[PDB]
Assembly symmetry: C3
Amino acid sequence: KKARMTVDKDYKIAEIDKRIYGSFVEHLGRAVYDGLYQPGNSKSDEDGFRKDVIELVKELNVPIIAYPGGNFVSNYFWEDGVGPVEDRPRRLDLAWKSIEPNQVGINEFAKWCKKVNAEIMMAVNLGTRGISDACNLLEYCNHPGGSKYSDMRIKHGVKEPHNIKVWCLGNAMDGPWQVGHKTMDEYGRIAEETARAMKMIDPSIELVACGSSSKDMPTFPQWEATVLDYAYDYVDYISLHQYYGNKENDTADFLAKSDDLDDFIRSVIATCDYIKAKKRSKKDIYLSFDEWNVWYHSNNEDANIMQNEPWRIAPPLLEDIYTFEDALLVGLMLITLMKHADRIKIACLAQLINVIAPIVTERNGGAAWRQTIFYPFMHASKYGRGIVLQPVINSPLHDTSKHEDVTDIESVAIYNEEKEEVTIFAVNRNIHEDIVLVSDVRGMRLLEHIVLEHQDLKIRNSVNGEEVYPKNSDKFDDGILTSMLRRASWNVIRIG
Amino acid sequence: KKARMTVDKDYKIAEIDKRIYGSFVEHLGRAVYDGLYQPGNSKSDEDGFRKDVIELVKELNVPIIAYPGGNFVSNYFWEDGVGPVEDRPRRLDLAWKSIEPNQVGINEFAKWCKKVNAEIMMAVNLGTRGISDACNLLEYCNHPGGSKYSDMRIKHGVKEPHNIKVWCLGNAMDGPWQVGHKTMDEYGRIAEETARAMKMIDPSIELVACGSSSKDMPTFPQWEATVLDYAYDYVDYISLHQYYGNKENDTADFLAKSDDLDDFIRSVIATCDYIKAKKRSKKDIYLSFDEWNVWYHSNNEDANIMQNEPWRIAPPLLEDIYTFEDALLVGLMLITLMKHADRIKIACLAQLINVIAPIVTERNGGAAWRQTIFYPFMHASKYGRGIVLQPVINSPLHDTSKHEDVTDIESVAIYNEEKEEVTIFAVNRNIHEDIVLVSDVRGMRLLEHIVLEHQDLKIRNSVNGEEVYPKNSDFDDGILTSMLRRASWNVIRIG
Amino acid sequence: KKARMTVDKDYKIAEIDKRIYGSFVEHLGRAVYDGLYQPGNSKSDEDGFRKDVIELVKELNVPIIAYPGGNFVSNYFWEDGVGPVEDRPRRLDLAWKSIEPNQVGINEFAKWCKKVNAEIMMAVNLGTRGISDACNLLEYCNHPGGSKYSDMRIKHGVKEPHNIKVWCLGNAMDGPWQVGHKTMDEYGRIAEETARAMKMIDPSIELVACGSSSKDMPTFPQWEATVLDYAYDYVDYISLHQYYGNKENDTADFLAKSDDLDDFIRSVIATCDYIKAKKRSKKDIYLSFDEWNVWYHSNNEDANIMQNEPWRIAPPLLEDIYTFEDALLVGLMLITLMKHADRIKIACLAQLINVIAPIVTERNGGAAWRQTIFYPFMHASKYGRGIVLQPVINSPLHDTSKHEDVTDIESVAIYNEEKEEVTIFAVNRNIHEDIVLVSDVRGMRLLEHIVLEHQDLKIRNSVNGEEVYPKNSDKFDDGILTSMLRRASWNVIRIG
């Protein structure tokens, strides 16, 4: 019933990189086609982009979006998606057994990102292509003009370079389901050489080396160590991928899964710091969590489409319909991410549109709507720009199914000294009993207390109405912030 | 004196896979140009195909043909051989030091394979190309339409996909004479990733991984083990290559070399079975004997065309003219292939037309004749489909200059249940004494007893006529008695 | 004061291969553009070649010229430099942060090599390209016709094949500044297979395997050993790179650095013969010393041009202006090369035009003048064709700051049996004392004593006049030569 945390400004973690509120669009399912891009639609614009989708993205204020994959990138030929659209070919997308029509390519997607106030984090193909092709694409995007590929971009209609700031050296390739699968030293060598070459063309870019496809691979985390060992002096980030599912239908354990997330982040840092000592380097590899979400609902329908109905265009893949308990675990993951904002400078919600996404448009031109997970994200990205304060918290515990000593209240404070405000993000992961959590504000005025609750953990949103939406309204005035957060709740208590 | 055999239909070995009667055409010498393809010739059809060759091929009944290499494929660019013929380039063929005009490519050779009732086994270049090129070729050949390379095929005039069923992951690259030479780990890695990507485009194909170039390579059989260890769950066959010759003209030792072939097959099976336990797999790798023949006659001649007359188009390379004793070895080799039909599911007599071949056309535009080796192959492909019963044989034994305890008789029974026939193939490789064969059929009415025999082992065939060719020869109750002339091939039948 | 040698015409070392007087033109700085190739110049022929530049090269009697790199080749795409000039693209040159216009390419540079009576020694890109592009280019240059790339050369207006005799399998790729950098095992395998395939196209070419980028790399000499261990049977040469500098400004220690050159050559020979024993081969690998010179003046300026002013065409990179002491080390190095003529069969002064060069043209279109180092190379290339005899010399030794027991008089004698003359090359690298050179010629009349001396060890040349030049100055009875050698002098004594 009683849980307590000291809040000290003078005990920071770090400042938040706005790029931790990033997302991800893969040429996958209906993310692009019958997704953000619907050229005939009445809700679309000059370029065929759905204007309603643009606004919901803008509501999320995402600064950076990873593109174009993902597994799709490992067998993608960027030239296929540029130039006169009537000459762009159709290709087999081996990853998702689909036909890519390439109507959207680099320059279309670059426009879309401007309209949503975002920047591209661009992946290159290092599965079936290599060094010279990454150099070609980089020059096309970033070099002003006067050379083969920059002039060819100008010719395609983009006079100024896109100047993409962050690039991913391929996509994770440790798995047998991935075209262009590599051993960890193979990937290490090609990542090193691509990054060396790319930095000669544009030394102001930042480079992400790929980690394991998941923490469960037998090659994690040696893969991460081997790659950094080769490429350390040319790369700035390593990537983590993590998804959670509630296929066991065990809401107790499900929301304890953010503790495995904390374990995972820590050992990736440990691996980074080990290679740092080995190189005697002053640089710190930063973490780029470029794939994270809840993902389990649409598993079976997805393996029916592949391979019973393969080589369709924009099949309805990975269409998880999210519940309210999912939006809790999403908020728990965001808290865990903010709590590690000293090393995690990029993170991408996978994915942005239609595909395990917070934004859905109905098939065949349908309307757009917000999934449950839309809201815990929109809060974090809105009230989360500031400085993380260390979490010194005493909160009761509980066992769950297959997790022990599991905290009942996870929380983090963010002090925007910039324009006086402290925001507390807190989740009661006890699904039974409410708990009252106050906060010894040792420093600094109760603003509001937005909440996200429902008695039906399995309720969903839909094009016919949101059953999960922020309601500001709840229960401090002295120096000792007193709040009680209902069981299975997500709250953003603000203080000014 | 006599040799005894029991044959009974309950004691089976395997159903012969019909693809052990396939063959092989490389862009090599006169196999294609001045061979199966002579476009302005009175004997060729519109497409340019010698019809006498087309008809000779159909007599062999070969259901699958390996194309287009062989060493040639290790530096071939398949785009050179498709589309507007006027626009195809001439390329240096480094394997055989020739010029390749590329008038025959995929769509031509596919057309020709229709007219001989045969399928293609397609090799891709993994010598100097890799994954994405194999994926383009497979898409071009097997994807229906609606994609860049499927459409490009349609646009080249083949509306329906060739739907090739078996592919070869490169060609043997373990040798210092080959372009694109690899170590065993390089090849394993490249075989694995090509196989994986190919099965995503068309999961219905079968894939062949290349063995050693020959069992005499120091890296045999570790190459086979390394490749299958990498590629096991993505490939269906491992390949074998064997050739024999008689440069030391010792006909007895020569005819004993089928014992070597058998040992080679067994060693490859054990290698497969070892890696299978390593993987804890329920799957067996199957064997593809996609290069086998007699090969030695033309060696000096080919060494003079290389290196004194390079960069010809259609030089007469590898033009072995086979003797009667070569046909005997080929017959023993087929019998051995038949005895291992439980693991060997594809085999390719190398090669089909003019190049170490059973079908010949005389240089510069006309001939078409049958070599000595033509006939034991034709018989086997004819009366060899069915189920192999194992041989329960006790036959006399002899030594030779380099072999010990060689059976004087070697044989095998094939029972086509859809014909209530049981064909027996036997070679008496006692080159001196004849032998009579007692075959306790526990069946089950004789229909014929074909034979291939000649007094001089060194006799050849020619455009002038066939000195060697099948003739007739010579069962009552539970036994059938058949005498086998010394140094002879025998096809005996039951009904 | 006294330091002597005997000169027996049959204590022989070996005959001189004239290709040890070769050189090197890279697409670097002003070597080509605004150097040997200036189209609208009054001093240029109709093909845009500077005529005075042609004359000075012909003066140095350079039989073979390495082209087009150097680091440049490791990202070069040869197709960009052939066919109609208007269809040639501009490329980023990652090695030297320049724009490469490709107005000169291979067919132009083959024409210029005719005009200077030299042959191309051709390097193929093994950095970002491999076997099949080496074959393409070899076929283009050396195949008569009737195949795709030979007919493409014909159709570009060169009917006869260039028939290039010596190819370099890439360039040094052991350095972290090099595009396409490779481990020694990666390089040895691609050199092995490229050589194998090229020898099948043209068995009469010779091939050089690349050695270490310098003797200071931690991987030297194992790099050389590994690559020779893969490719022994398909290659004829291993290459060495050497540069010296005088940033310490210790003119005594400076001129003793030719002792280090000598130790270095011996190291590479020892490595070769170790691999010979290992292969049980009858063949000796010969040495291609395809990069040597003094280089250190322009270091600071060069680092400014990149990256302060990157992506210029023909920036003034590596425009060392050499002093007289620089020319004595060049003469001491030429003497050391001659002494190892039994193994060293090719050598390239790096480089020929403007880029650390003996021939300079003033920026923006006109000059042509000879640097200090022009003359010792000019002498050695002219009188140093013959047979190297073993120098048995007793000379006083001195110490220097970093060297011990350093010879005062470095000498060697070349005997041309045709011309009945014998040429002796000698350098007094004692900068203080004067010394005499008798020379017991156990041959057996005097004919000349050409000399390079100067008061100022730092005097340079310029477009305003050659402060350093050969003077028929200086002044043999029965069969005993005797000649005096001033401090810090280069002397060429001739007997006939």
